[PDB]
Every structure is written in C-alpha cells, then in structure tokens.
C-alpha cells in the first residue's frame, strides 16, 4: 500500500448548478435571481430559459442577464426591469456549457407569502 498518500487537493467537470438564492419579489422591483454555479472551470456559453425564451446576454424582454465570477466558480444574475405577476407563473432555467459537458437548474420563483400562512383564497 502507499504509505501517506500526499497529493493536491482540486476537482474538475461539468458546471454544477446548486440553486438560486431567489427572494420574494416586489410587483414593481427588480426580480434578481442569482445562481449559485460551482462550475470549476467555469462554462464557455450560459442561457436563461424559462418557457420559449431564452436570453444569453444583454438585456431583452424586461430581462438583464449577468455573469459573475467567484472563487468558488461563477454566478449568473438576472435581473428583471419591471417583474408582473407573470413572473412567478413562469419557471426559470439556467442552462450553462462547459468544455466538460452542461447541466440545468429549475427555479420558480415564488410570490411574497413564503413563511406566511395568512387567509387564502379556496
């Protein structure tokens, strides 16, 4: 066997998407939805779809895409000019590349009243 098996400590592949750090969004503000990518390396190409849209970059449709780069790996920001009800009603998909290979993230972002059982229609 090997005595004490010294070696470097570092990992590689496909861009893991854990989740989104989504928040209850405002009818009216911005409805950011940083992704938390632990890509390593990171993804060439990234794309945000949710139904039949799909914004790369730039800013299109009330939607402003942002990458961003971490230590840990990287993070994507979309941000939403004016967020309607429509929003919530829409499920969200990042879809990131890497010369390792892709992977997706569901995201649906919820409407105010996480913790917050009040009177609901029925």
């Known amino acids: 066997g ?8 570092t990992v590689n592949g496909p861009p893991i998407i854990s989740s989104t750090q989504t928040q209850h969004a405002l009818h009216g ?3 950011q939805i940083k992704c938390f990518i632990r890509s390593t ?17 730039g800013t299109s449709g009330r939607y402003t895409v942002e990458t961003i780069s971490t230590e840990e790996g ?8 004016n967020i309607v009800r429509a929003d919530f009603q829409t499920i969200y998909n990042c879809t990131a590349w890497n010369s ?4 997706t ?3 649906r972002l919820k409407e105010q009243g996480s913790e917050m059982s009040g009177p ?3």
């Open 2 to 9: 090997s005595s004490g098996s010294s070696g470097t400590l």
């Open 29 to 31: 503000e911005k409805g």
């Open 41 to 57: 390396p990171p993804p060439d190409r990234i794309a945000w779809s949710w139904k039949e849209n799909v914004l790369e970059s």
């Open 74 to 81: 990287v993070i994507s920001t979309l941000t939403i000019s």
């Open 100 to 103: 390792f290979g892709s992977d």
């Open 105 to 107: 993230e569901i995201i």
């Open 120 to 122: 609901s229609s029925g």
